Amino acid sequence: SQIQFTRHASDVLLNLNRLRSRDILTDVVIVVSREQFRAHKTVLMACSGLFYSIFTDQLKRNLSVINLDPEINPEGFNILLDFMYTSRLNLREGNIMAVMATAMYLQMEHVVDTCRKFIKAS
Amino acid sequence: SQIQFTRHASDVLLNLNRLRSRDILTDVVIVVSREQFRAHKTVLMACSGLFYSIFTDQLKRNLSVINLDPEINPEGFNILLDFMYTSRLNLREGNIMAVMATAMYLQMEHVVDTCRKFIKAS
Ligand SMILES: Nc1nc2c(ccn2CC(=O)Nc2ccncc2Cl)c(=O)[nH]1
Ligand SMILES: Nc1nc2c(ccn2CC(=O)Nc2ccncc2Cl)c(=O)[nH]1
Ligand SMILES: [Cl-]
Ligand SMILES: [Cl-]
């Protein structure tokens, strides 16, 4: 019976992206081959089964640096990180495979399913 | 031109609320009279001009405890914290004044405007 604010969650996520853009309260660096990306672990955990499983473990919860698998494409990772913080997924014919494989590794199943639809549409 | 995931932001916020419920990566305690509430500073900053202005300042960014003004009603604060993490605002005839005054202090203008509409509707 509570009053629903239909743009509140989008507003929150937009503001979290602003904080990331300013490096405010970012608490991890994700290293992907020669590139580095800062983020909030809470957002990563909210959006990825890989990051959820890492940081939920009390053994790895306080890690400040995560080295991803060396074969992960940094562009694919960057597209997915941007998706996490914007709800918008930059899928293109030139990047679909990289994005889909990276989403599999990150355990982002709805994104993988959407990549499977993009392939079905060419 | 990117693909829009229309429930992504709501899903993120729901997962952040799950993390709060488990005290995972919470980084502040808000003390309101005799009560204490743990939260993520990033979500507080995203939702309140008071918390934004506090934690953006490099002098107070690493504070782990914030004592709110002693006159703030803890119930009003709890309703607003729940709103921050759910997009749902528990406004009732028995709590409207407390919620509205607390939202003013937290600098949550859209919520204050909604409290002004609730009053206009009785
Ligand atoms: N395994 C897997 N995890 C995923 C997605 C999408 C998102 N997450 C993460 C997720 O659910 N996090 C979460 C769950 C429960 N409480 C708190 C949190 Cl932060 C997916 O497709 N697969
Ligand atoms: N003063 C004031 N602040 C508010 C609201 C609602 C939300 N916020 C906070 C906010 O905008 N945070 C923000 C802004 C820019 N970049 C990052 C972040 Cl986290 C309000 O009504 N008034
Ligand atoms: Cl910081
Ligand atoms: Cl923790």
The 3-class SS string of chain B reads CCEECCCHHHHHHHHHHHHHHCCCCCCEEEEECCEEEEECHHHHHHHCHHHHHHHHCCCCCCCCEEECCCCCCHHHHHHHHHHHHHCEECCCCCCHHHHHHHHHHHCCHHHHHHHHHHHHCC
User: Closest residue of B to A79, CA-based?
Assistant: B2
Tell me how far the alpha carbon of residue B53 is from its chain's centroid. Answer: 14
Cα–Cα distance between A66 and A72 in angstroms, integer? 13
Min Cα separation B121/chain A (Å): 13
Contact criterion met (CB < 8 Å) for B12 and A84: yes
Q: Which structural domain, as residue segments, surrounds residue A39?
A: 1-122
**How many domains is chain B built from?**
1
Degrees, nearest 5: CA angle A90-A103-B46: 65
Contact criterion met (CB < 8 Å) for B5 and A90: no
DSSP β-bridge partners for residue B31:
B36, B67
CB B91 within 8 A of CB B56: no
Question: Which residues in chain A touch residue B42, judged by CB atoms under 8 angstroms apart?
Answer: 16, 19, 24-25, 40, 42
Q: How many CB pairs under 8 A join A and B?
A: 110
User: Closest residue of B to A16, CA-based?
Assistant: B46
DSSP β-bridge partners for residue B28:
B39
Cα–Cα nearest to A73, from A102, A47, A116: A102
The answer to whether the Cα torsion of A20, A53, B10, B63 is positive or negative is: negative
Tell me how far the alpha carbon of residue B103 is from its chain's centroid. Answer: 9
- Taking CA atoms, A11 is separated from A94, A99, B12, B15, B51, in Å, by 31, 26, 12, 16, 16
